[model samples]
Target: MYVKLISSDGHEFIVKREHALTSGTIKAMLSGPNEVNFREIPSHVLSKVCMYFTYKVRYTNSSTEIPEFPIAPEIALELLMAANFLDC
Candidate 1:
């Protein structure tokens, strides 16, 4: 399976199901009846801080303690807004 993700800067990335499965959120969505098609995941909305966290969550390959990182509240808010809009 594949999922489409669009950033705020208009950058679009096609990710494999396994890659997206790195995130619990996306995993749950995949388990649902409806398949996730094109979804906009705004980078600006995610903010650098949140993006760092999300990146770690999606790409981390160890069971070690999760690292602490800063998150932009505004961008996080926007990310949530866009996520809600896309029902992701």
Candidate 2:
């Protein structure tokens, strides 16, 4: 299934269940078949640091073992917020 994620900067991204599995939290949520929908992701919660971590997970090559940037705590919160609303 497909889910919609809206970033704090107002950017909207559509992600498929397989791709979203890059996130452990989302993977757990996928255990059940319920629809998830979120409207807003707080900017403070989704700081640049967190985005960098997520970016690495989404874009990093298979040969890469280390993340380029340190994952920020705030961004983790934003990810959870967005994940909570997404559904498969």
Candidate 3:
């Protein structure tokens, strides 16, 4: 099952809680009692982060296989800066 996380820009993403919660900052935001059930982080950026979560769960630390993540090259810098929010 997935939960909704909305962005101020009006974008909404439906994602698995385990994938979404990998971002430490997001977990705290949603964990509080009476907190908004959704997150403010834009889905645009969150999409990239979601891939990170997928990679983590799909790959082994000692595995020799390397998977490629499809990302928006233009947004690379922003995601890096925003990475702090996910404890990256």
Candidate 4:
């Protein structure tokens, strides 16, 4: 029911696997039978990305438009790289 996501900076998040799959990339990786020990995604971006995943799942089946999830402008470029790396 839940999976642990670890960050390169040594942070960890516990989330439901279904919510985690909101990203096509994550869904693809998890589709296989490999061990789930993942790394490299920074905790900060991973946290926000996971939050977006939750938002996605919450609004996906409803008529309600999804709300904006904010990212600090200062980290926009780094976050972009992080998102790209994670296949977001």
Candidate 5:
């Protein structure tokens, strides 16, 4: 029901499979392994990316309007690259 995601900085995140499945890249990797190490995604960006998935899954089928996912401007570029890499 859960999986391990390791950031480039060695930070570890224990993420739900459902949440992880939201990413095309992660979903593809899950079929081969439950634990994935992202060498390109540093701790800060990786943490935010994971949180986005959680937010998305929680609000995906909501009856009410969904809240926006926030990103700090300082890391927007890096996060955008990560999102492209993750295909989320």
Candidate 6:
């Protein structure tokens, strides 16, 4: 099933529960309420965060040949804050 992640400006991301659970914060959220939201993160920032979760899920157990996850210069700080908030 999908885990719904809502951003500050009302944008929603329907991500796989497995990928979304990679974040400690989201895992904690799911431990209680079945629904969760990130009121602190805007859509663009949350978008990148979801991409990071996808990246993390893909590479977490790779034996080798891991690729660098790309972050845009403009949103780097905001993305960092979001990542820290998520504890992924």
Task: Rank by lDDT, highest first.
Answer: 5, 6, 4, 3, 1, 2
RMSD of each: 5.1, 6.0, 3.4, 2.2, 1.4, 1.5
Model 2 lDDT per residue over 1-88, tens place: 6655445566555556555666555566667664333346554533442344456556665665665655457466656555454421
TM-score of each: 0.43, 0.39, 0.67, 0.80, 0.94, 0.91
Kindly list the per-residue Cα lDDT of model 1 for residues 33-71, writing each as its tens digit.
724433355455533423443566554777777666554
lDDT of 5 at 18: 93
Position 85, candidate 6: lDDT: 88
Candidate 5 residue-wise lDDT at 25: 90
Better of 2 and 4 by TM-score: 4
The deviation in Å at residue 69 for candidate 3 is 3.0
Supply the global lDDT for candidate 4: 0.75
Best by TM-score: 5
Put down candidate 4 lDDT per residue, 1-88, tens digits, no spaces: 8877777787778889988777667777888772244466677877887887788788887897767878889868867876776675
Q: Whole-model lDDT, candidate 1?
A: 0.53
By TM-score, how accurate is candidate 4? 0.80
The parts of candidate 1 lying over 4 Å away from their true place are 1-3, 7-9, 22-43, 46-61, 83-88
**Candidate 2 regions off by >4 Å?**
6-12, 33-35, 38-40, 43-61, 64-67, 70-88
Clashing pairs in 5: none
What C-alpha lDDT do the candidate models reach, one value each?
0.53, 0.52, 0.66, 0.75, 0.92, 0.88
Instruction: List model 6 lDDT by residue over 59-80, tens digit each.
Output: 8878778898898799999988
The residue pairs in collision within model 1 are 45-75, 49-70
